[PDB]
Write a protein that holds these residues in place. Structure first.
Motif, PDB file in Angstrom:
ATOM      1  N   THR A  64      -1.173   8.682 -14.326  1.00  0.00           N
ATOM      2  CA  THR A  64      -1.206   8.261 -12.932  1.00  0.00           C
ATOM      3  C   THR A  64       0.178   7.996 -12.356  1.00  0.00           C
ATOM      4  O   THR A  64       0.282   7.388 -11.286  1.00  0.00           O
ATOM      5  CB  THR A  64      -2.047   6.995 -12.776  1.00  0.00           C
ATOM      6  OG1 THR A  64      -1.809   6.135 -13.892  1.00  0.00           O
ATOM      7  CG2 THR A  64      -3.534   7.333 -12.726  1.00  0.00           C
ATOM      8  N   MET A 100      -2.778  -0.968  -9.462  1.00  0.00           N
ATOM      9  CA  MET A 100      -2.951  -1.149  -8.025  1.00  0.00           C
ATOM     10  C   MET A 100      -4.436  -1.319  -7.765  1.00  0.00           C
ATOM     11  O   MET A 100      -5.229  -0.466  -8.169  1.00  0.00           O
ATOM     12  CB  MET A 100      -2.392   0.031  -7.233  1.00  0.00           C
ATOM     13  CG  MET A 100      -2.288  -0.233  -5.739  1.00  0.00           C
ATOM     14  SD  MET A 100      -0.616  -0.664  -5.225  1.00  0.00           S
ATOM     15  CE  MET A 100       0.083   0.960  -4.939  1.00  0.00           C
ATOM     16  N   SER A 121       0.811  -1.212   0.000  1.00  0.00           N
ATOM     17  CA  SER A 121       0.000   0.000   0.000  1.00  0.00           C
ATOM     18  C   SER A 121       0.847   1.266   0.000  1.00  0.00           C
ATOM     19  O   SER A 121       0.446   2.268  -0.603  1.00  0.00           O
ATOM     20  CB  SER A 121      -0.943  -0.001   1.204  1.00  0.00           C
ATOM     21  OG  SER A 121      -0.322  -0.584   2.336  1.00  0.00           O
ATOM     22  N   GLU A 122       2.007   1.250   0.660  1.00  0.00           N
ATOM     23  CA  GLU A 122       2.850   2.437   0.705  1.00  0.00           C
ATOM     24  C   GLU A 122       3.588   2.679  -0.603  1.00  0.00           C
ATOM     25  O   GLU A 122       4.048   3.802  -0.839  1.00  0.00           O
ATOM     26  CB  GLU A 122       3.861   2.335   1.851  1.00  0.00           C
ATOM     27  CG  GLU A 122       3.255   1.915   3.181  1.00  0.00           C
ATOM     28  CD  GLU A 122       4.272   1.901   4.304  1.00  0.00           C
ATOM     29  OE1 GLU A 122       3.920   1.476   5.426  1.00  0.00           O
ATOM     30  OE2 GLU A 122       5.425   2.319   4.064  1.00  0.00           O
ATOM     31  N   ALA A 123       3.713   1.661  -1.451  1.00  0.00           N
ATOM     32  CA  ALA A 123       4.268   1.863  -2.777  1.00  0.00           C
ATOM     33  C   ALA A 123       3.323   2.721  -3.617  1.00  0.00           C
ATOM     34  O   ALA A 123       2.160   2.950  -3.268  1.00  0.00           O
ATOM     35  CB  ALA A 123       4.528   0.521  -3.466  1.00  0.00           C
ATOM     36  N   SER A 124       3.839   3.208  -4.736  1.00  0.00           N
ATOM     37  CA  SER A 124       3.086   4.076  -5.626  1.00  0.00           C
ATOM     38  C   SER A 124       3.094   3.488  -7.034  1.00  0.00           C
ATOM     39  O   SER A 124       3.633   2.404  -7.280  1.00  0.00           O
ATOM     40  CB  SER A 124       3.660   5.496  -5.608  1.00  0.00           C
ATOM     41  OG  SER A 124       4.129   5.852  -4.318  1.00  0.00           O
ATOM     42  N   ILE A 125       2.488   4.216  -7.965  1.00  0.00           N
ATOM     43  CA  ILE A 125       2.451   3.791  -9.360  1.00  0.00           C
ATOM     44  C   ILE A 125       3.780   4.135 -10.016  1.00  0.00           C
ATOM     45  O   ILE A 125       4.388   5.171  -9.718  1.00  0.00           O
ATOM     46  CB  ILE A 125       1.264   4.444 -10.093  1.00  0.00           C
ATOM     47  CG1 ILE A 125      -0.039   4.141  -9.360  1.00  0.00           C
ATOM     48  CG2 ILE A 125       1.172   3.952 -11.536  1.00  0.00           C
ATOM     49  CD1 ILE A 125      -0.417   2.679  -9.376  1.00  0.00           C
ATOM     50  N   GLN A 126       4.239   3.249 -10.904  1.00  0.00           N
ATOM     51  CA  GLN A 126       5.473   3.372 -11.674  1.00  0.00           C
ATOM     52  C   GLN A 126       6.727   3.233 -10.824  1.00  0.00           C
ATOM     53  O   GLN A 126       7.834   3.467 -11.327  1.00  0.00           O
ATOM     54  CB  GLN A 126       5.533   4.691 -12.454  1.00  0.00           C
ATOM     55  CG  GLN A 126       4.270   5.005 -13.235  1.00  0.00           C
ATOM     56  CD  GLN A 126       4.210   4.284 -14.561  1.00  0.00           C
ATOM     57  OE1 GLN A 126       5.188   3.673 -14.990  1.00  0.00           O
ATOM     58  NE2 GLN A 126       3.062   4.356 -15.224  1.00  0.00           N
ATOM     59  N   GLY A 179       3.324   8.063 -10.240  1.00  0.00           N
ATOM     60  CA  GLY A 179       3.626   8.590  -8.930  1.00  0.00           C
ATOM     61  C   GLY A 179       2.488   8.564  -7.929  1.00  0.00           C
ATOM     62  O   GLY A 179       2.736   8.800  -6.738  1.00  0.00           O
ATOM     63  N   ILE A 180       1.254   8.284  -8.363  1.00  0.00           N
ATOM     64  CA  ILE A 180       0.115   8.345  -7.454  1.00  0.00           C
ATOM     65  C   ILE A 180       0.261   7.296  -6.368  1.00  0.00           C
ATOM     66  O   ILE A 180       0.582   6.132  -6.639  1.00  0.00           O
ATOM     67  CB  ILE A 180      -1.208   8.149  -8.206  1.00  0.00           C
ATOM     68  CG1 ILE A 180      -1.337   9.155  -9.338  1.00  0.00           C
ATOM     69  CG2 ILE A 180      -2.393   8.256  -7.250  1.00  0.00           C
ATOM     70  CD1 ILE A 180      -2.731   9.305  -9.855  1.00  0.00           C
ATOM     71  N   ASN A 181       0.031   7.706  -5.126  1.00  0.00           N
ATOM     72  CA  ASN A 181      -0.148   6.790  -4.011  1.00  0.00           C
ATOM     73  C   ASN A 181      -1.626   6.796  -3.652  1.00  0.00           C
ATOM     74  O   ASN A 181      -2.156   7.822  -3.213  1.00  0.00           O
ATOM     75  CB  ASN A 181       0.709   7.193  -2.812  1.00  0.00           C
ATOM     76  CG  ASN A 181       0.648   6.177  -1.689  1.00  0.00           C
ATOM     77  OD1 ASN A 181       0.093   5.089  -1.851  1.00  0.00           O
ATOM     78  ND2 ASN A 181       1.214   6.526  -0.538  1.00  0.00           N
ATOM     79  N   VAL A 233      -6.157   1.839  -9.263  1.00  0.00           N
ATOM     80  CA  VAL A 233      -5.580   2.639 -10.337  1.00  0.00           C
ATOM     81  C   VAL A 233      -5.099   1.683 -11.421  1.00  0.00           C
ATOM     82  O   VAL A 233      -4.444   0.681 -11.120  1.00  0.00           O
ATOM     83  CB  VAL A 233      -4.416   3.521  -9.840  1.00  0.00           C
ATOM     84  CG1 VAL A 233      -3.445   3.839 -10.976  1.00  0.00           C
ATOM     85  CG2 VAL A 233      -4.938   4.796  -9.206  1.00  0.00           C
TER      86      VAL A 233
END
Lengths: 432, 586, 449
Positions: C59, B42, B20-25, C61-63, C10
């Motif tokens: 999207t 995600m 959950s603490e990770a992000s996109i890319q 970098g989105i958390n 996402v």
């Protein structure tokens, strides 16, 4: 170990349950209710269930009583130095009923990616003995060179000739040949076998045989096996290997078949879409590594659709594979053996492989002047295409003797004729 | 950090929970081996990770951990003279650490040497208000290039302590008082590969670049900050052209990017670039060059990322006030990485299998190249000039790659194999090639030279166009048939092509032509053409002109070999022309 | 203020918010990232207490856990004011030229209302471009969709700026403004347009929207809708004779494809999106005249020539829906005439309503047709030059061909920055046909004038 929880069978696929520590692309073997045993490979693994494809098929399986065992290792090929003189099936299992081979070690067949800096450029040519290959688009050890031909054009016959006459001038140690037959008929396969036995190259060669009868998934492994064995001989044993693979077209057909079996969304022109990478992974396992004696050369034989509209796209591979060699049936019709259309064939690495000290250096100059003679000689006869009412009829007959002479003699040297490079040069001189 | 757990493995796709603490890319190390991968989806706390390396032998339950960043590069000292792949892996160090000629799977190495000692020289004084991009000090990385340490973006405040000395990359060199408190500054900063670096403002490129090569500078120039696209047909000598541009162009640094090549094609670049010689210092080009190289069978994402990694580094050295030139070869291969990567992501195909955002992607890349004012108090100017080699991929101009490239670039150097067959080097087709910078460059050129350079260039190009039409006429009729006026224009065209247009890259003096020398040479040819045309209107016959001018014409041909100190001998040709021609008419 | 912290999932540019209430189809949203960055997004679909949205910037970098979605409560809209004129905005209408703040009169849905079929009036009154070939031979009328078809490099950009600076309307008591929409052009091109506008004082009488080539595709789509919304406002609501010019429409088609593939709905049937035809028709039904109102909307969509063999959908589409068209030729640019307007292939269908006695000169109509036939015949001479090579010189060819070439370099080639007025064009073309004999003159009356 010996899980007995098959929960589904669909087509050639299976679903297993309550399995753990199962990795992707992992070999399994199935114990049926009748004690029959079949091999399969994991293709998808979930939290607890896993899903595999069976090579032989799913006919005759009773899910309640059948069992599955997870071997714990992906597809491997056992390597030994005793491989020479031997014939294996698609999965590198003995096919000649010879002595049992104890593997020195078992190798994963996917191979590894040579570090770009580590790779050593190829500077020494290989004498095919073919005037229509040696002089012009010359082959250098470690080059990736493919021959494109239509069915029945004698592409297989040329491949045999290359295998028989391939050698290098230094010859401190003799050459080694690895040959893979991919999804070809028995008659086709038998041709190669007979030639090798008759010529005695079996003792000096190693081969892997995959016929059309054999399952498609074995075709995928067949190239990987041949190149892994080639790499073993080449780098760990320092041999100089020429790898010849016959009809990667059907490897590509099998690639599509497996992709559809795995319910993968098609890529460009209905093919899997990772064809560029899959072919490049295969073809790029060649060349020489600096700091090691051995070398790997590839001459993939490829059936070419007359139309450019569909099959394993010539330019999909052609720019992957550092030049190419073209055969045509239109050529072949008039006793032109090996029918090598020389107009569009090139060896991308010809310039460096050609020079004094590695070749008799009339050759670079003479090849270039005969390349001019190709263009001008074509001008002289080839370009006419039943026209040239006046063109070539005005004491251009030197031209209008050159190229027809060249096309007949030079291209058709005879399939069982071996021309030393100097000779090829000389017949070029004669034609000069 | 949080350690995830693999719940699914299907081909290149891995799915991990408790992330959950990770992000996109973000970049993750996947499995016990820790192969590189990137998050694309995600759902709740589970993420769909794309693995770049091979996923064979990886299964569920293995741990996953995230780098906490997208694809990124390390920017600092020790980056020059390095052989990188697309994801900034140090190939040279890759061998010695692992003692293998193979690119290991899931092998993690830092890009830069984090434990070499550099003499940091503090050029700034404490208590100075700094913003993003101010230069606190420098490090002499190589004998040629001065590496300046600048404040990373997102940092604003006042210097607290700063002292020179021998430091590694990792140990802090200065402390900055900020609103959030104090931030220590290393010599190295990281940057995401696909997010373009910020600038005060972008502005037009109007200053041409001296490439030394005559045809380029004269007829199809490229501005510092422009974009030049060059096709690469086999055996056209494109390799030689790239090397010539790299070592002779008046740029401070060169960035070469090999997107996906044939391996042997790659190794040639690797061996020949260290052997290139910087002219003004006599040292290797590698002392001011950064080389990124990926062979064909490498992880596809490294090949797609190659361009962005190269241009990110060029943007790094651009913000220092340097002029950077970035060479990409081949951009066609890069688009192929895109098509395959798009297929792997179940996208909707567009033009000839290419994704629909091809032109958009290429536009994003080429728009980063340009002349800008870098961030900082100094308001310094930097520039990136882009040379992209588009492999024809079958001889055609309609390829989506080539068309979309030409939609956002202004310079076209069409390499022609026909001219290479005729021993015409550099084999740039003057008729097919063009530059949309020719107008602005002509203005700048006229001013600094204080001559009518634009008129000269236009006259030469006009003569060449007329030469095409005339020799097509000749094929139908005969060379005798046309007038002495037209036939004279033919021979002047031959003079342009042979003396001025053709250049031998290996000759000591022919390789590079000073801008003033370019002017003097072209003037020699053009004054000839004018005086002979005049003498024709004065009634002298072509053949008589020919003889008296054979003598001086040999001087014109050998004039392209004259050293740059002895330019007086070129202007003297003008005098000799005028007195000879006027003498022939008696 | 309503913003939800609940992001279920996402996927690429798509995003799913759950436990939301009161969201509606096509609302804009803003995503508050954990680092405070903002990205405008749009609502693709909404069901139950769930909402699925697309982000314009992507999207990356989105958390999901630490970012929240703020629903604006309004669709994509343009803030309009009378003082818009003389200002430069981007594809989404944000100001790009620093400058004062803008207090809009109101906000408008950029898709726009649908005209009542009876209320819309025919295009009637004449618009002067200042370019001879457009005004004289292939006239443009207010409320007409007339496009410009050109190859990549043949001064289309120059011709657009051309028209923008010179276009005006004669003998009217009502102000005339120009709206310029640049769709997916490179920075260098955009700067060329802006600098030219600022230099020639053209900016003072125009509003322009700037969408760069590397700008997000959804902004790229939005720019023409936005431009026409401003155009309609000035034309009808504030009673002006707006002229809308959109640079390189073909770019817009590309952007539709990119977006359509991202959504996955309407998968391409011929390579580009399903309904590009209807989309272009929607844009192009906006130009017109409402009966009972002073104002008018004209648009000159410019787009790139197909190159003839990488044949594509765009040539048939706008042309299918456009009221004639105007063609440029590369050979002509290379030859040197400027603008390079090849007349025989191109035409305006609605010449007559615009060109006419009183509105323009009486001669103009008759003179235009005669001059056209006189060049059509310079074509005859060129065609008797096409196979001629250097064949025997007759009488028809010799005088007629010269007339053509002179027209080319004297009437087609007016020069980019030369602003020929209508009266000038007519007298020049009359003079420019009178060198020719009186045997073949369609109007027997008024031999010289």
């Amino acid at each position: 170990k010996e899980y007995r929880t098959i929960k589904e069978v669909v087509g050639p696929l299976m679903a297993v349950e309550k399995v753990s520590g199962v990795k992707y692309e992992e070999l399994i073997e199935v114990r049926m209710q009748n004690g029959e045993i079949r091999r399969g490979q994991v293709l998808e693994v979930q939290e607890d269930k896993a899903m595999v494809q069976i090579f032989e098929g799913t006919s005759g399986i009773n899910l309640k009583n059948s069992s599955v065992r997870f071997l714990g290792h992906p597809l491997q090929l056992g390597v030994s130095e005793d491989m020479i003189g031997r014939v294996f099936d698609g999965l590198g299992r003995p096919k000649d009923n010879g002595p049992e081979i104890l593997p020195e070690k078992y190798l994963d067949i996917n191979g590894e990616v040579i570090n770009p800096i580590a790779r050593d450029y190829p500077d020494e040519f290989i004498q095919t003995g073919i005037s229509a290959i040696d002089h012009l688009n010359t082959l250098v050890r470690g080059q990736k060179l493919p021959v494109f031909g239509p069915p029945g054009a004698g592409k297989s016959a040329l491949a045999a000739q290359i295998a028989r006459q391939a050698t290098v001038l230094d010859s401190s140690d003799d050459f080694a040949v690895v040959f893979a037959a991919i999804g070809i008929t028995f008659e086709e396969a038998e041709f190669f076998m007979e030639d090798f036995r008759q010529t005695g190259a079996i003792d000096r060669s190693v081969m892997f045989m995959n016929l059309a009868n054999d399952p498609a998934i074995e075709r995928i492994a067949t190239p990987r096996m041949a190149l892994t064995a080639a790499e073993y001989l080449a780098y760990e044993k320092g041999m100089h290997v020429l790898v010849i693979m016959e009809d990667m077209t059907n490897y590509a057909e099998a690639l599509r078949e497996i992709s559809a079996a795995r319910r993968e969304v098609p890529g460009r022109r209905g093919y899997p879409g990772y064809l560029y990478t899959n072919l490049a992974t295969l073809f790029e396992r060649a060349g020489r590594i600096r700091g090691l004696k051995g070398s790997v050369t590839q001459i993939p034989i490829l059936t070419m659709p007359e139309d450019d509209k569909t099959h394993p796209i010539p330019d999909l591979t052609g720019y992957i594979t550092e030049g190419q060699i073209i055969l045509t049936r239109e050529l072949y019709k008039s006793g032109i053996s090996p029918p090598i259309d020389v107009l569009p064939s090139l060896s991308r690495l010809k310039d460096k492989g050609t020079g004094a000290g590695k070749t008799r250096e009339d050759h670079a100059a003479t090849m270039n002047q005969l390349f001019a003679a190709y263009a001008q000689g074509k001008q002289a006869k080839e370009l006419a295409v039943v026209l040239g009412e006046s063109a070539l009829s005005d004491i251009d007959k030197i031209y209008a003797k050159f190229a027809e002479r060249f096309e007949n003699e030079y291209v058709n040297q005879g399939f069982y004729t071996n021309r030393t490079i100097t000779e090829t040069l000389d017949l070029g001189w004669e034609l000069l | 950090m949080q350690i995830g757990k693999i719940i699914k493995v299907s081909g290149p796709l891995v799915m991990a929970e408790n992330m959950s603490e990770a992000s996109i890319q973000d970049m993750c190390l996947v499995g016990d081996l820790g192969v590189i991968g990137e998050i694309i989806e995600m759902r709740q706390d589970v993420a769909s990770i794309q693995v770049y390396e091979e996923t064979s032998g990886i299964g569920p339950g293995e741990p996953v951990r995230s780098t906490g960043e997208a694809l990124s590069v390390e920017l600092g000292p020790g980056i020059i003279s390095q052989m990188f792949d697309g994801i900034q892996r140090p190939l040279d160090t890759f061998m010695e650490v692992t003692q293998s000629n193979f690119l290991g799977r899931g092998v993690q190495l830092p890009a830069l040497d984090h434990e070499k000692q550099w003499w940091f020289e503090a050029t700034i004084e404490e208590g100075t208000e700094v913003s993003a991009g101010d230069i606190i000090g420098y490090v002499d990385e190589t004998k040629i290039i001065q590496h300046k340490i600048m404040v990373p973006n997102g940092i604003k405040g006042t210097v607290q302590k700063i002292e020179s000395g021998s430091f590694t990359i990792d140990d802090p060199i200065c402390v900055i008082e900020t609103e959030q408190g104090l931030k220590e500054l290393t010599m190295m900063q990281k940057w995401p590969v696909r997010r373009g670096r910020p600038i005060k403002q972008k502005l037009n490129p109007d200053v041409p670049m001296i490439t030394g090569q005559r045809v380029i500078d004269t007829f199809f120039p490229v501005t510092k900050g422009g974009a030049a696209a060059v096709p690469g047909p086999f055996g056209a000598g494109k390799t030689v052209v790239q090397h010539q541009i790299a070592k002779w162009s008046d740029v401070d640094l060169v960035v070469y990017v090999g997107c996906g090549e044939r391996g042997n094609e790659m190794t040639d670049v690797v061996n020949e670039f260290p052997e290139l010689i910087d002219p003004n210092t006599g040292e290797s080009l590698m002392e001011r060059t950064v080389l990124i190289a990926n062979t064909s069978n490498m992880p596809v994402a490294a090949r797609e990322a190659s361009i962005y990694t190269g241009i990110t580094i060029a943007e790094y050295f651009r913000d220092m006030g340097y002029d950077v030139a970035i060479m990409a070869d081949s951009t066609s291969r890069w688009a192929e990485a895109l098509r395959e990567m798009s297929g792997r992501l179940e996208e909707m195909p567009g033009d000839e299998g290419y994704p629909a955002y091809l032109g958009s992607r290429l536009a994003e890349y080429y728009e980063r190249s340009g002349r800008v004012i870098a961030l900082g108090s100094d308001q310094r100017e930097g520039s990136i000039t882009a040379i992209s080699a588009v492999s024809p991929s079958g001889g055609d101009i309609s390829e989506p790659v080539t068309q979309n490239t030409l939609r956002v670039v202004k310079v076209f150097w069409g390499l022609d194999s026909s001219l290479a067959q005729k021993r015409h080097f550099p084999s740039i087709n003057w008729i097919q090639s063009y530059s949309l910078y020719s107008t602005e460059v002509g203005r700048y050129m006229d001013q600094i030279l204080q001559q009518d350079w634009s008129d000269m260039v236009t006259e030469g190009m006009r003569i060449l166009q007329e030469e095409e039409q005339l020799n097509e006429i000749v094929r139908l009729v005969g060379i005798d048939s046309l007038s002495d006026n037209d036939r004279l224009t033919l021979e002047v065209a031959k003079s342009i092509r042979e003396d001025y247009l053709q250049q031998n890259a290996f000759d000591d003096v022919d390789t590079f032509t000073s801008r003033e020398k370019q002017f003097n040479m072209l003037k020699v040819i053009l004054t000839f053409g004018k005086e002979a045309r005049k003498a024709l209107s004065l009634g002298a016959y072509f053949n008589e002109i020919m003889e008296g001018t054979v003598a001086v014409r040999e001087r014109i041909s050998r004039s392209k070999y004259i050293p740059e100190e002895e330019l007086a001998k070129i202007s003297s040709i003008n005098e000799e022309i005028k007195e000879t021609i006027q003498l022939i008419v008696s």
